[model samples]
Structure formats: structure tokens, C-alpha cells
Target chain A: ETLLLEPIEGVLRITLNRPQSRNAMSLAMVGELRAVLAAVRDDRSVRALVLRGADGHFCAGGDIKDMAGARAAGAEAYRTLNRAFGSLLEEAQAAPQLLVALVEGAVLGGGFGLACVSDVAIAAADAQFGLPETSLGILPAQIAPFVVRRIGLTQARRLALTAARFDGREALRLGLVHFCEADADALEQRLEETLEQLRRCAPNANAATKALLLASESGELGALLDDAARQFAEAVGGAEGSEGTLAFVQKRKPVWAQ
Target chain B: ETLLLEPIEGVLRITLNRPQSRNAMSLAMVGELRAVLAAVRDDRSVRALVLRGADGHFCAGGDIKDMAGARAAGAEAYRTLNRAFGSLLEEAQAAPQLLVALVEGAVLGGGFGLACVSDVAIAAADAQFGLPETSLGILPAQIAPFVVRRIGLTQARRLALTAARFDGREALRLGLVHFCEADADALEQRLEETLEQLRRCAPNANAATKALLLASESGELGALLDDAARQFAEAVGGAEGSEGTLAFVQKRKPVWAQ
Candidate 1:
């Protein structure tokens, strides 16, 4: 299994388990993540969600080897994978739970996108982050909205254009991460304390507060839902969606997996 | 003239000439300021608009003596003055030319509102700013939108409730000002260099860039305008607006004026 879902008290910790690939997201892993997140959203007992990766390595982005195999299959195969990855992020943003990304090691590309969509992000002192997708001929289009909102357009343009990898300290300075822990142990301890603080608040108030904050930052939820619905419908009827769906059932990676 | 307008190179410098009143915004001054800004907006030769006061003081706020006299006349007398002042800020935000407020000394209440509406604000080292409206049994309702958007709601609540005065260094730290100069002379020199740099860029591109930045920050212009318009209309019809405006046009000091 490339994913592990465990409940620590009232906190649901979803760990990406592929340490060898730096927990790079594969199609199967993405599906598993979607499932876990969906379950947490519906689970009343789960007050918060902490997303991290195993073996001291956060996600390094999409699995390159899987992407290569999918690309060789066809263009259609790549489109489906893209849609799924995009959905995961969308779901994370809209999820009712208080989501936090506890990042360490390398969090690059798609992983950066995931970290940004969460309510709060804490990174380890040695952690590094970058979106080098454009350097590899792929733009960080999906991540643009979140990144722009997080740090404002000035820093977004600078970081996106330069594809610069910044340390956790720089991320904290830019308001990308709420806290920076010294190490993985510290990260876990801090997360535990934070969760305890959150648990003291009324769950309904917490949900309402989270909703209000997100709405203020992202605007009305109806508009977002409408856009998502339109995009989802288009993808379902499109060739890319068809190929991606077919490849997933066959246990093959889609193109552009990297 | 209560307000002095000087054309230096490509910069149109508007200096408030009321030193005794801490450059309190008067009816004549506000009208003239609006006209000057409108002219600057249409003038192709003027690349930037720099607003400052003649004395060490920037703007203490709307004249309070004028308010007491207006309140003596009738409640309706004050309403007209607020309409004018609110219109001035609305026009400033909508103006095509680059607007910068070179603030120093005391900037409080209505003065703070003017600073908030500018595209970029640079304050002197010893400058003090606050929305002291509440201290006078009034609210900074008209300035709320700009204030909230500039800083987050959390900081906005604290400042609005306490009516706390913050120095230039603290203001800059809170993202209130683009820069804080060492002194008035340094401020002018820095403003000159900044204006010159702006003049080197393509005019249309500069305008577009500004639009893009606003759009990225405020979500969309139409939504922002609608919200501002509603708030302005409500505020104009309210008690505080009535009192604030009457004091301005009547050329008397408001209750909060020192």
C-alpha cells in the first residue's frame, strides 16, 4: 500500500507511504488519498486531518516512472490522471475538516500544491519546496490560484518564474507555512498540541469558522462548485478522461505522471 | 490656496498647506484635491501623483470645529460633507494614474482613510496612524473595506476596536506601507526615484499590471465596487458620516480634532 490512514485520538493522520520515491504520488496512491479524505469528511468523530509522508520524506510530486509509462500509452491516458490529481486538491480545499499539512524533506511540484490548499501548514527546518514543473515543460496552472492567494502575486511571480527552492524558514516568512518545527519529532509534538487546542473549540464553531475563512479568502462556494461541475462534466465526456479511466482499471500509469 | 499642487518632472505633488490644523482635510481642500487628482488622471504627462502635507504633519483628520458648527445647524448639514469626502476616496481608487501617499506626522481618522485608498503609501519614520473614529463615538465604517482588504480581518478587528495608534515601522511591518523613509527629505528623494522608475515602463502595461494586481488581491473589481458602493451609501446616510461631513465643508474642527 502506498498510503496509510490512521486515527490518532480525534485527529486523522493520512501518511503517504512510498518512501523510496520520496512519497511521489502515483495513480493508486492518489485514489487512496481521495478515498481517505472522503471518509474523513463524512466521519463526524474526525475533528482534524493531518497529512504527511512516511520515512521523513514528504511528497516529491508525481511518480516520474509511472508518468513515463502512461505517456508511452497515449495522450488520452495522461488526461485522466491530471483530472484525478486536480480533484484531490479541490476536495482537500472544500473539505469540512481542519486540514493541516506537516511537511518535511522535499515537497515539490504537486506536493507544494497540496500543502497550500490545507488550512494550516507546518514544515520542518530542513524541508525544501519548489514548483519546477515549468522547467520541465509543464506549467503549475492548477496550483496558481492557491499559490497566488497564499503569498500574493508579487512573491508568486518571483517564485514561479525562477523555480527557486526555498527552505522552511523562507516559507514561514512568506506566510506559506504557519509554523516550522526543528525536526519530525518536533513536528509531531507541535501537531499534537495544536490539535489539542483545536479540540477544545466547539466543533460546530470550528466548522463555521473554517467555512467563513475559506469563503472570505476564496469567495462564495457556489461559484466554485459551478466551475468544478462544469470542468468535471467536460472531462467525463472528453477523450482524455476516457483513456485515463481505462488505464486506471488496467493498473497502468497515465501520461504526464511526472 | 489651502492645497498646493506642484508639477516636478513627471510627478504632481499635492501638499496640504494647513500646518496649524495638522493639515486637516477641509471642504475647499478636499474639493481641490479631487480636482487635482482628476486632472492628473487625464494628464498624459503626469506619471505619478504624490500627496503630502506642507508642515511636519500630514493630515490630522477632518476639521472638528467645522463639525460642531454643522451640528448646530442641523443633522442634514453634515450628510453633504461626508458624500464629498467619500467620493474623493472612491475617485482616488478608480483613478488611472499611480497614487502614492507620502505620509508623515499624525495620520488619524479620515486622514487614515485617505492613506488607505492610495495605491502605495510611504510614511516617515515618526509618523503615527489610527482610525480614531470610534474614540469620538463614531466608526471607521467607510474605511472598513479598504482596511480589511489591506490587512486581514484579524488585525482589522484589533485596530478598529482599540483605535490604537501605530508608528511607521509597525505600519510597514503590517503591510500598511510600501516603505518607511528616514525623514521628509529622504521620503521626497525616494518618491522621486520611484516615480522615475515607473515612468520608464509602458503606460498601458503599467495600468494593466495594476489592474492585474488589484484583481488578484481583491478577487474581482465588480464585486469589490458593489460592496464599496453599498457600504458608502449606508455610511453616508448614517450618523457618523453626517457629523464627519458637516465639520469638513463648514471649515470647523471635528470632535476628534486635537
Candidate 2:
């Protein structure tokens, strides 16, 4: 399996397991990721999701060999790849769970896009980022909207036009990544510390706040969020609501067996 | 006249006199400034405008004595000062000509608001900026929109809440000033150099680009700008536009004969 899903202390850690390929995202991997993320969104046991890559390196973006093959085939092949990967990213962003990307090693091209879409991103000092798509006669169209929203249009233009390599510190300066760690070991410690802080916060309030933050930034998602909230409220008002309320009043966790 | 206006090589240099009160902006000065700015907007010879203060200080904001007395006189006095200053700022922003603020010494309160409205700002290294209205039991309601646009909500919130003084370097970092010179002497040289660069560019294109940039950022202004463009085009086809275009194409100075 190229994707491994593991749960530890109410956090679902999704690790890209293709170290040999430097964890480059494949169509199959993205499909698996989409399914796992959907399940996480529905699983009350999962309070957060942590995305990381295996071995010493993070992802090197989409598989270049697959891209070249797709280019040779036709435009439809490229569109298929784009749809699959882009949908996976949308799922990650839309999922109600708190999302964090623990990044180290080489994080470039589409890998940078994935890291950027998460609610919080932690990168090691050695981690490098670049979007060299323009150099190959292709634009990072799929990531442009997210990138522009993350950093203002000025920095986005500079990075996209120059395609310059930036370290974790510069990324922090530009507000690209929320936090930076000194090394791989420090990165792990920092992630653990942040996770601990998240665990102490009220899950329901955190989820609501996250939704509000997203709505304030992007109006298009705001309408869908209203519908989702209405449906959720309806579902919670049934038998499950009484059980959850009783459990909270009794200072106990609600069982999912029912 | 409290305000001094001089024409030097196609640039109108307006000096805020009365440095004893740190060049506090008065109602008379505001009226004169509005008239001068409107004339510059229509004049073909006045290619650029520079706002500075005599002595060693920029305006320290509206005369505090006026505010203190107005408090006893009630809302009518407050509204009078507000209308005059507000109209002056509105006219400056709507003017077609380029406006640059040569800020030396202290810029606080209404002075800060005036500087915020200018298209380009150059400040001395030792200069300071502050919006101390909150401390005086008043809000920066009028300047909020312009200040927020220059700096993001986060920095604006910090400055508005604390009413802290920010040095010229901090002002530059926050995008408040385009450049900072070492002293008043250096400011003159730098301003001249900047004007020389602006002269080489096409004036019509510069005006259109500024208009487009503002419209792109402000959604409300977008519709009004269409009407403004029609008026602007009509005016550009008149005698002033003929001389301006001729000056550009012939590589000669534009003559403004009364």
C-alpha cells in the first residue's frame, strides 16, 4: 500500500509510504487518501488529522513519469490526473476535522500546494519549497487560488514569476507556513506540542471556529457550509442527541457501538 | 495664508506652516489645500504634487485645542472640522495627478490620516506615526478604511487598539511609506529623483493603472469608477490633454498659460 492510515491518541496520521519515489502522489494514492479523509470526517473518534511523508524526505509533487506518460497520451489523461488530485485536496480542505501538515525534507511543486491547504502547517528549517511548473511550460493553475489566498497577490506573483526556492524561515515570513522547527527531531517535538494544545480545546467549538474562519475568507464555501450545518443539526436532534447530552452531563465519553 | 503653495518644475510643493503646533491642520488650511489640489488635478503643467511641512515637523494632526474646545461646544463643532477634513481627503484621493507626501518629523492623528490618503509617501528616518484618537475617547472612524487597506486587519487592529507610536522603519514595513530618507535634505533629493522617474512614464497609463489598482481592491468603488472613467475620458480630450499628449510625444515640457 502506498498510503498508510494510523490512529494515535485521537489523531489520525496519514503517511505517504512511497519513500522510493520520494512520496510523489500517484492517482491510486490520492484515491485512497480521499476515501480515508471522508471516513475521518464522519468518525467522531478522530479529533484531528496529521499528514506527513515517510523516510527523510517529504513529497516531490506529482509523479513526473506519470505526468510525461499522460502528456504523451492526450489532454484527457492530464485532466483525469488533475481531477483526481484536485478533488483529494478539496476533500482535505472541506473535512470538518482539524488538519495539520508536518512537513520536513523536500516539499516542492504540488507537495507545497497540499501543505498550504491545511489549516496549520509545521515545516522543518531544512525543508525547501518551490513551484517550478512554469519552467516546464505548465502553470500551477490547480494551486493558484489557494496560494494567492495564503499569501497576498504581491508575494504570490514574485514566487510564481521567479519560481525561486525558499526555506522554512522565508515561508514563515511570507505567512506560507504557520510554524518552523529547527530540525527533524525538533519538528516532531513541535508537532506533538501543538497536538497537545489542540487536545485541550473544546472540539465542538474548535470545529465551529474553523468553519467560521473559512466562511469569512471565502464566501463561496459559506453557502454550502450553511446547508451542511442544517443537516448536521437535524441528525444530532434524534436519539443520538439524548445519548450525547447524557454522556456529557455524566462526565463520560459517548459510546459509538450503538 | 496658513498653507504655502509653490510651483517648481511641474511639481506643486505645498507646505504646512505653523510648525509651533507641530503644523496642526486647520480649517483654513484644509479649504486652501482642497482648492489647490483640485486646480492641480486640472492643470497640465502640474505633473506631481508634494506635501510637506515647514520647520522640522509634519502636521501633528488636527489642532488639539480645536478638539478640546469642540468638546465643550458639542457635536456641531466636531462635525464642522470633520466635514472640512473629510472633504479635503476625499478630493486628494479622487485627484488624477500623482500625490506624494514628504513626511518629516511627527505624523499623528489627522496628519496620519492625510498621509494615508496620499498615493505615495516618503518619510524621514526619525519620523513617527500614530493614530491617538482612541486615547482621546474617539475612534478613527474616518481613517479606518484607508488605514485598513494600506495594512491588513491584524496590524490595523493592533495600532488602533494600542494607539502606539511606530517609527519610520516600522511604517515602511507596514507599507505606510514608500521610502524613508535620512533627513530633510536627503528627502528633497530623493523626491526629485522619484519625480524624474515618474516623468519618463506615460501619464495617461499611470492614471489608468492607479485607477485600475484602486478599483480592483475596492468592490464598492468599481461601479462608481465606470462613471468616473467616462468623465475622465471626456476631460482628457480637452485642451489640457492635447498639451499633455503633445509634451509626451514631442519630448518637451507642457506649457500652462493662463
Candidate 3:
């Protein structure tokens, strides 16, 4: 299977299962990714979603083997590429549930895009990341927005323009990933630890907060702030909010605490 | 005096001087903060503006003893509080000159909000920060948007919800503060070093870049992208950009360096 989907304890794990291909993104994989995301669009049972790859490597990015053919096919093919890639990024970003990335090895170009759009990313210390688009005489057009949003444009400019590979430590320093572990075991441990933390928070509250963040990102500031205030007040008056506040003051764990 | 404003070497140092109360935010102080912010808004001569509190500690947030019972006053009063606090944050975030925070000791609630809104924040090693609003049956409504924007919603949730105070080192690890100094002397040295770097950038270009960053925070991403492209191209053709590019290519320091 080029794509593997598994659900465990309400967490959906999507694995890019092309080890021999170094998880390079063929157009076929893109179609599968789109379908997988669509299937989970309203899966409220799924509290968390994880993205990774197989055989110790994440993804080498778009399949350059077929890239020449894609280029030669002209405007329609390029448009398809743009739509598929761009939607994939937007879907990941716009998802309501917690989105997490477990990066193992190579994370370049499109792979890097996945990392950038994730809510939280955990990577092995030696995992590699880079955006080599400029060196290949093209722009990181599709991923640029998400990349710049993740790491401020100043460092984003240096990375996207330089095409130099940096390890997980540098990625952490750049705010690209939330955590970086020294090895595979540590990576998995940290991933689970983060998952534990996310799972402990009130589901409705987390959803509300995420929506607030995404909404404020691209709107009139005053209008958004007013909307945000309304949301905050509404949340504090909700069932989960009362429980959280009461538990906080009562010196006892909330009902949702695992 | 509740507020102290001094000018030194083209930098405006605005200190919240109520050390006896740990720089509590009084109504009079808010008026002073507004005036100080307005004073530097268009003053190109003031290369930077630094915010700090007198004595060893930074601030203890609003004087809760004076806080009206928001639970009793209903929504409109809360909205007024929101507008005043939110605008103060926006002014700091939108300033033309570089805005910096030199934090020592406690930075709680509204005090922590000031740090989040700064373009650059430096902290003494033992400095502490947190949002304890929830535990006290209130929302960090006013500061929520800015805090979420400064540090992504993921970290913001953990900090605001937990109401747990953390030191400067943890703050640096979480992308809260840009730098953490070991002590008072180190803090001063690092602030000067940051000032030196800021002073080297062309004023017009720096202003343009910061405006661009702020603009990207809200509005249509695509529209802003095109807007940015146009601005960048125009800048490259402008005198400051021309000098910068030429100097970069000629292997010499830019003229903006002092």
C-alpha cells in the first residue's frame, strides 16, 4: 500500500507507506491523501490525527521522476498539481481536530509543507528538512505562505532561498517543530507525551480556541477581536468551561482528566 | 509618579514606576502609557522604545483590588475594558519604531500581555510569566488574541489554561522571549546588542518590513501576498533597497550601519 491508514484510541494515523520511494509524493499519493482527509472531515470520534512516513524516512517530496513529464504537459497538468498540493495543505491547516506530524527522516519541499501546516510537529534529532525549490529554478509557491507563517519570513526567506539542509534541532530553533528528540525512541515518547497533553484538554474548548486562532489570521483585526471576545465568553459559560474552572478551584481533577 | 519617561541616545525608555505595587496598571498609568505610545508613534528620530518596570520586578498586572466585579457589571463594561486593553496592545504591536520589553521578575496577566505584544522581548533569567485569569474565574479575553498570535495557539492553550508560572529559560524554549539573560548586567548588554543590530537596518526598509509583517497577520493571504510582492519590487527599485543590494553585492557594509 502506498498509503496506510490506521486508527487507535481515537487517533487517526496516516502513513506515507512508500519506503523504497523514500515516500516521494507521486500524483497517485496526492489523490489518496485528499480522499483520506475528506473521509475524516467530520469524524468527531477522531480526536487526534498524526502524519508520518515508513521505513525511517518521511518524504523526499514530489516525485521528480515524473516532474519533467508534469512540466512538459503544460498548463492543465501544472494547475492540477497546484490544486492538489494547495488543497492538501489547506485541508491539513483547516482541519478541526488536532493535527500532529511525526517526522523521521527526509522532509523536503512538499514534505516540509506538511510539517509547517501541522499543529504540532515532533522530529528525530537527525531528521532532515529543507526547501530546495529555488535552487531548481522554481519558487516554493504553494508552500511559501504556510512556511512563512510557521517560521517568521526573515528565517523563512533564508531557508527557502538557500536550499540548505538543516536537522531537527535547527527546525526546533526555528519554531518549525514543537519538539526534537535525540533518536527514534525519544521521538515516539515525546509524540505520545504531547498527544497525552492534547487529549487531556476539553475537546470543545480546544476546537473553539483553534477556530479562534485560524479566524483571526486573515480578517479585519477589530472585527476578529470582537468575534474572539464573544467566543471566549461563550466558552467560559459552557459545560466544559464550568467543569474546568470548578475543578481548578476545588483542587481536584476535572471529569475529563484521564 | 506612576510613569517615568526618559530619552537617552535616541531611545525612549518608558518605565512603569510603581515599584511599591510591582508596577500595577492603574487608570492613570493607562493614560500615561497611551501618551507615551503616541509620542513615539511618528518620531522617526527615536530609533527604539523600551518598556520596563522600576526596581527588580517587572509588573504584577492590574490592581485586582480596584478591579470592578465584572461578574456584576455585565458584558458592556467588560467590552470597554477589552477595548482599552486591546488597543493598548495593538498600538504597541503596530508602532513604527522598534518596540522592546526588558522583563525582570513577575509578568502576570496584563503585564505578560505587554511582553507578548513587543517586537522584541528580553528577560532576566529569573523572570516569571503566566496568565492566572482562569483560576480566578475570568478569561484572558483582552490579551488572548495577541498572546495566541505571538506564540501559536498550541502553546498559548497550555500557558493560559494551566495558569502556571514559568521562568525565563522556559519562556525562551517556548518562543515567548527572544532572549534570556543571566542577570541584570547581561540583560542590559543583550538589549544594547539588539539595539545595535536594529540601528544597522535602513529605517525606511525596516519600517516597510515590519508593516508588511503586521499586514500579513490579517486580511486575504493571497491579496497580501501580491501586495507584498509589489512592495518588495518597489523597494528594490527604491533608494534604500538599491543601496542595500549594491552594498551586499559589492562585499561592503551597508550605509545604514553606524
Candidate 4:
């Protein structure tokens, strides 16, 4: 088994369990992940999905053996294999529930792409990140566009071209991760606090906001704003928004909180 | 006169000359900037454009009087005036030459938008940044989209909603600026060093790279990569790329370096 899934309270914590390859993404792991994502896609009770690794390391990259097999199978097979992971990323990014990445140790190539797709990322001080594909005479491929979206094209180009490895502080500076903790204790504390913050937000409201935010980048500004304005008007008249405002007025927690 | 222009070497230094109002962008200043940008758009001689402010401040925001006048001129007039500045921002972002912003003091509202459009930004320690429009019951309007583009939607939303004020270091962390310096001397030193680094890059190649980087955000990954590959091949066969490779083989500096 490559993934250890635990449903505690409203959070579904998924741990990558292949310590042998530093939890490298194998074909089986990818398929397992897709299945897990699909199961929770419409599950309103699962409020948050937490991604981490079982051991100290997060993920090394793609499984080397799988890639070697793909290379021997020829170009078409490799293309199909690669595009499958990219589709997973697209699905993960658009997940209705809160998506969070708890990163430690190696976070290269595929791992880095996973972090980019998450709604939030928390990195440990010991974590290291890079796109090492260029140095290996290969390209980041599927991860390139997502990386560009995550930290702008300028920073992405520099990192990809130089294959520069950096720690949590630099990653924080580049806006690659939302929070970088000093140690294991601090990382756990930060993760708990982040989840608590998420709990306070109404689930449907949060999902709508995330969708609107993502749409803001590609859609025409005026048109997006007009649509956002309509959404805002509708929300103000909706149940969740009504309960949220009423709770605020009464100085009490909203019903959405776990 | 609100704008002072100085040409030195290959750099055109444009100073916001409104110390009494802390370099607030007036109507005349906007028109002057548009003219300046137009003049330099096709001129290959100017390799860099530096934007700074008079006295110690970069820019406060849009001129209060201009907005007040527009409010009186009715909704249609206000919409036209706001969209004009947005058009200016789009032009500035796509400028051929390397664009840099030297930020100090207040960098709020319109000033914040200008920094967002810049290819590079160096901020002094004392520089303060925020989107303080929400408190005044007005949205950031034209600047909102670019601010979202500069720093992702999550951060832009927080800053716009809270009207939070932060310093240069925070701005650097937010990816609003590229570099943050301790004082005036260090700021100047960093600016000079950055410009020198830009000088080493071939003008045409750099322009093409900038275009590709911007295009990466909106275009599909597969299509964009295919286009990029073609461009890369053409570049390798072109004058600048040929000279660069030959210079490396000869163990000497390329002709592009100043």
C-alpha cells in the first residue's frame, strides 16, 4: 500500500507510505490518489484533505523504475503516462474541499507540483524544494505551467533553469509555501492553527471564493468582477451568509465550526 | 510639471516630481507618463527604464482632487477615467525595455499598482505598502487585477479587505517587489547592480523571453511549450544566441555587455 488514509473529525489525512523511494510517486500511487480524490469529490462531510508523507521525507519525485519502463515502451506511452498525472493535478486544484500540503524533507519535481496545486502549503524548516529535471537533461513538463501560476513566471524560470535547491525560508520568500515552521513541533502547531482557521470559514462559501479567485487570473477583469458582484449579491441572500452575519452580530461562533 | 525625465547611459530615469503631495499621480502626471512610455516603446537605444519618486516617497496614490472631480462628473466619466489608468498599466507591463521600480516611503493604491506592473522592483527599508481603498469605501478598481497578478489572489484579497499596511520586507515576501534594501545607499547600489545584470542580456532575446514568460500564464501548457520550443530553436540559430555560444567557446565576454 502506498497511501495511508485516516479520517479524523472532518479532516482526511493522507500519508504517502513508500519510505523506500522517499514516497516517490509510482503508477499505483497515482491511481490510488485519483480514486481517493474521486471518493471525496462530492463528500460534503470531508471538510479538509491533508497531504503528508509517513517518514521524514515528503516525496523525492516520480518513481525512477516506472519512468525507465515508460522510456522502453516508447514516446506515446510516456506521453500518456505523464498527462495522467497532470490531469490529477487539475482535479486536485479544483477540489471543492480545502486542500493542504504539509511538506518536509525532499519536495522535488512531482512533489513540488503537488504543493503548487494545494489551496494551502505548510513547510518544515528541514524541507528542501527544487525542480531538478533540467540538470537531468529532461524538463519539468506538466509541472511548468502550475509552477508559473504558483510563483509567477520570473521566479519559476530562474528556479527551473538553474535547478537551484533551497530550504523553507527561501521557499516562503518565493511564495511557494504559505507557512514555514522552524521545527517539527512548530510545524504541527502551525498546521493545527491553519486547520482551525479553515474550520471557521463556511465550507460552501470558501469553495465559491476559491473558484472565483482562480477565475480572476484568466478571465477578463471587468467580466470577472461583474460575475463576482452577482455572486456576492446572491451569497448575501443565501443561508450560509445569513447565518455568518447573524453569528457575527451576536459575537458567537458560526454553525459551520467543528 | 509632475514628471522629471533624465537620460543617463542606456537608462531613462523618470522621477515622480510631486514632493508636496508625496508624488501622488495627478492627471497631468498620467498623461506625461503615457507620452514617455510611447516615446520609448520602439526605441532600442534605451535598454532600461527606472521609475522613482521625488524627495523620499515613491507615490502616495491617485491625486485626491482628480478623483473628487471625477465623482462630481458622474458614473460614466469615473468609469472612463479609471479604465484609462488600467490601460496604462497593461502597456507598462508589456513594455519592451526592462522596467524597474525604486520604491520608498508610501506605496499605496495607484503606487502599489505601478510596482505590480514593473519587471523588477527594489524597495528601501522605509517603504510602506498597502491597498487602503476599502477603508474609504471605494474599491481598488483598476489596480485590483494587476495586484492579483503580482501577488496571488489570496494575498491580494486579504490586503484589499483588511487595508493592512506592511513594510518593504513584507512586500518582498509577498512578491510585490524583488529586492529590499536597508537604506538609501544600499537601494542605489542594488539598483545599479540589477541594471548592470540586465545589460548583459541581449535586448531582443530578453524581450522575447519576457513575452514568453507573460504568455505562459494564460496559454495552454502543451501549446505554449510547442511555441516556446520553436522560439528557442530560432533563438539558437539567431545572431544573439550564436554570438553568445561563440563567446563562451572563445572564453570572452559577449558584445551585449555594457
- Estimate the TM-score of every prediction: 0.52, 0.52, 0.70, 0.59
Chain B TM-score of predicted candidate 3 relative to the true chain B: 0.90
Question: Residue-wise lDDT of candidate 1 within B1-258, one digit each (tens)?
Answer: 788888976668888899989989777887888888777776646756778877788899898777666777786766777778888888876665667788999989888888877766788989999988888898786778767766667887899999899999888888677678987788988776656445433233234334434454556523433332333333333343344344544666433221
- Residue-level error in angstroms, candidate 3, position B124: 1.8
Residues B96-133, candidate 4: write the lDDT tens digits: 77888999999998998999888788998779999989
lDDT of 2 by residue, A1-258 (tens): 688888986889989888988899887788788889887776656878999999966788877566545536554556546656656766777677788998888787778879878888999878888864432323454555556556643345335433457788878877889999887778888888888777655455456566666555535576868866884685567565566677779977655322
- Model 2's chain A TM-score stands at 0.83
Identify the runs in model 4 with alpha carbons over 4 angstroms from their true place: B1-214, B220-258
Docking class of 2: incorrect
Chain B: TM-scores of all predictions: 0.79, 0.82, 0.90, 0.95
> Candidate 1, residue A172: CA error in Å?
4.6
Whole-model lDDT for model 2 versus the true structure? 0.70
Per-residue lDDT of A93-167 in model 4, one digit per residue for the tens? 888889999999999989898999998999987799987553343456667777888988647654654356889
Error of 3 at B81 (Å): 2.9
Clashing pairs in 4: none
Report DockQ per prediction, comma-separated: 0.03, 0.04, 0.16, 0.07
TM-score of decoy 4: 0.59
lDDT per residue (tens digit) for residues A15-120 in model 3: 9988887899888888888887888777756777888889998898888777767867897988778778999999888776678889988999899998888878
